Amino acid sequence: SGFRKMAFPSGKVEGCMVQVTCGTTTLNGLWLDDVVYCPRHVINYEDLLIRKSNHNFLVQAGNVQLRVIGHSMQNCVLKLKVDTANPKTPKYKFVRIQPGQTFSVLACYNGSPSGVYQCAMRPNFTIKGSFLNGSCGSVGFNIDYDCVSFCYMHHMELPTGVHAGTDLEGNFYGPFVDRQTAQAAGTDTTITVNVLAWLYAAVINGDRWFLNRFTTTLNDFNLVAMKYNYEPLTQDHVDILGPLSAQTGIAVLDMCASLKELLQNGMNGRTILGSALLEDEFTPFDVVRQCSGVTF
Amino acid sequence: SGFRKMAFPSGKVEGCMVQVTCGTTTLNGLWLDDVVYCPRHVICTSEDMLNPNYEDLLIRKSNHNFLVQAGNVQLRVIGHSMQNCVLKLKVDTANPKTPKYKFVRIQPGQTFSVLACYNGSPSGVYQCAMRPNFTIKGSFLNGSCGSVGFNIDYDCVSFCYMHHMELPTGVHAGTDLEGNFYGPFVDRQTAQAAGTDTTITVNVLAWLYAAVINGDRWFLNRFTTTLNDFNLVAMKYNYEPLTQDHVDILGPLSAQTGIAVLDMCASLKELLQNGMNGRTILGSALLEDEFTPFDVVRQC
Numbered sequence: 001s002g003f004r005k006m007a008f009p010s011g012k013v014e015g016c017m018v019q020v021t022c023g024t025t026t027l028n029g030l031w032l033d034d035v036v037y038c039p040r041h042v043i044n045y046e047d048l049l050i051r052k053s054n055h056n057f058l059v060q061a062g063n064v065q066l067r068v069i070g071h072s073m074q075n076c077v078l079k080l081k082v083d084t085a086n087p088k089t090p091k092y093k094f095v096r097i098q099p100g101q102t103f104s105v106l107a108c109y110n111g112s113p114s115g116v117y118q119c120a121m122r123p124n125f126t127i128k129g130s131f132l133n134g135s136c137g138s139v140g141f142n143i144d145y146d147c148v149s150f151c152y153m154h155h156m157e158l159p160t161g162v163h164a165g166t167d168l169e170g171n172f173y174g175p176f177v178d179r180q181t182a183q184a185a186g187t188d189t190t191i192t193v194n195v196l197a198w199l200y201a202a203v204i205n206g207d208r209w210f211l212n213r214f215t216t217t218l219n220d221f222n223l224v225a226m227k228y229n230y231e232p233l234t235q236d237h238v239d240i241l242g243p244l245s246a247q248t249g250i251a252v253l254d255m256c257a258s259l260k261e262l263l264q265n266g267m268n269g270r271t272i273l274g275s276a277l278l279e280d281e282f283t284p285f286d287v288v289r290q291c292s293g294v295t296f
Numbered sequence: 297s298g299f300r301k302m303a304f305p306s307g308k309v310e311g312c313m314v315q316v317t318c319g320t321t322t323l324n325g326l327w328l329d330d331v332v333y334c335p336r337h338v339i340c341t342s343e344d345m346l347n348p349n350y351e352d353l354l355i356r357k358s359n360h361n362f363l364v365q366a367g368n369v370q371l372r373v374i375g376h377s378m379q380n381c382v383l384k385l386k387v388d389t390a391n392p393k394t395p396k397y398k399f400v401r402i403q404p405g406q407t408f409s410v411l412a413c414y415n416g417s418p419s420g421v422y423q424c425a426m427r428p429n430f431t432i433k434g435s436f437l438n439g440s441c442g443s444v445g446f447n448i449d450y451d452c453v454s455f456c457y458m459h460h461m462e463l464p465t466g467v468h469a470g471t472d473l474e475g476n477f478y479g480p481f482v483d484r485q486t487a488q489a490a491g492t493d494t495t496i497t498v499n500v501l502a503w504l505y506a507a508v509i510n511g512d513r514w515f516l517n518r519f520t521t522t523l524n525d526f527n528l529v530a531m532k533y534n535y536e537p538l539t540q541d542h543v544d545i546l547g548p549l550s551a552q553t554g555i556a557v558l559d560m561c562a563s564l565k566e567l568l569q570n571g572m573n574g575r576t577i578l579g580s581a582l583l584e585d586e587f588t589p590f591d592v593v594r595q596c
């Protein structure tokens with residue numbers, strides 16, 4: 001029993017964190033094979049990069065300085081070719097995630113991991129992370145079997161305290177750019193499929209007070225979802241929630257009628273899984289993983 | 297900016313997780329140097345869980361009865377001893393991945409990271425607090441016994457908890473790494489219950505200071521309180537008494553924000569009386585008590 005916000009074990013990623021220094025700027029790099037990936041703002045990025053030589057980039061892996069033998073830019077990520085392949089490189093892939101998907105973030109400062117937390121890519125493409133100066137280059141990841149899927153690299157903090165970054169190919173999530181200019185996160189919405197998954201996790205943990213005899217149509221639910229700034233629930237989401245629906249005996253549209261009642265009436269002083277708010281940072285897969293015990 | 301429940305990076309602990317099998321029971325072990333630490337109930341059978349005589353069960357065991365697996369490598373047990381509720385299996389290989397470590401026993405209110413494991417394989421990492429009733433509100437399924445709680449301050453891993461059992465309310469009880477249980481619990485299947493839980497007051501105050509540091513001031517008020525008047529109100533909401541030690545501990549956060557500790561105590565009293573009124577503090581509609589004053593300073 002128990003339901004916690006749980007991150008993947010960060011060990012495979014800790015062995016990849018390096019410190020990248022260029023001039024006065026120091027941030028984090030991800031050392032995979034013989035390449036160090038980091039935000040290109042560490043340095044007109046084409047004009048700024050052409051002026052830099054390999055020895056201008058100081059890369060530090062622990063107390064060992066790596067020598068940069070090449071540099072190239074891919075979108076908003078700088079790729080520093082180093083002489084040494086990382087012996088700790090795990091099986092990995094670069095994956096771009098969709099809003100609503102969750103991942104673990106290994107927050108780093110000076111190439112040293114300080115914390116790990118689990119979060120979701122908001123529908124407005126920001127992450128509600130926890131980052132201070134020097135955290136740039138910190139990465140988001142998931143693990144499947146022994147394979148690390150890198151999905152995020154931290155680049156900046158928006159004026160509202162939320163965070164923006166890119167995939168490992170340097171493409172930003174959201175309508176953001178990597179420079180000092182007026183940028184704002186769009187109005188956020190609740191990840192509906194994730195709330196439903198969390199309501200199933202609550203039922204699995206013995207919290208049933210919110211269940212009701214009612215069921216709704218997908219179209220009637222989406223009219224309610226639009227009114228409460230909840231993301232539309234698609235037939236794909238309903239299908240994805242299928243296993244949880246089978247395990248608990250609560251059909252997705254039966255759970256939607258519970259969600260609709262919770263949105264129109266509130267919690268009435270009650271909590272679900274120790275929360276007075278509807279949690280939306282657990283995907284249906286996270287719920288199955290945690291309420292079954294999948295290891296890495 | 298931002299405030300998240302943050303766990304320590306688990307890599308230093310992942311390299312220590314092993315699987316310990318004794319008969320039909322399989323759980324997790326912590327391999328440090330040439331010793332594997334695990335819950336002593338790994339030696340228990342079906343009719344042993346109610347009233348086990350661990351000394352009597354252990355004397356009947358031989359080294360080759362304990363199968364220890366580190367990855368796809370079987371470790372050879374060359375000795376065994378019991379220290380309180382932890383079994384210590386001497387193995388023939390020192391763990392090359394042993395980090396700098398220490399065993400620390402924590403007090404209620406203290407936080408730590410848990411590396412949840414099944415079959416010696418880490419599956420997740422989360423942040424916890426030792427409740428005032430000595431239980432932890434973890435996320436554990438069968439096979440998670442032997443999973444450990446830790447803090448990583450300055451490259452040294454401080455092991456503070458080892459999971460042993462789940463109480464009937466879904467909460468968890470365990471020991472320090474010297475095998476001493478936290479709380480009045482015993483490693484027996486006899487009727488045991490967690491005492492009524494209370495809110496860790498010093499942690500809520502630290503979290504209210506984190507909220508002020510992150511720019512949220514809506515809950516602040518023009519009042520102050522005496523420490524005694526705060527405790528008389530707070531105990532009525534099942535909040536732990538706030539001691540002068542706690543007030544002293546909150547001193548640095550009081551200095552950074554400019555809000556006297558007893559002034560923050562008056563905001564807490566008002567929040568307890570009024571609730572949040574549809575508002576949130578650091579993305580929460582409840583008062584968070586699993587961030588210590590040390591965690592708040594570390595993260596902010």
Ligand SMILES: C[C@H]1COc2ccc(Cl)cc2[C@@H]1C(=O)Nc1cncc2ccccc12
Pocket residue numbers: 001337345436437438439440441460461462463468482483484485
């Ligand atoms: C044999 C069980 C029950 O009785 C005792 C009694 C005493 C001891 Cl020290 C261990 C156990 C074992 C136990 O609590 N294990 C577990 C620990 N964590 C999460 C669990 C989730 C679900 C099922 C069991 C869990």
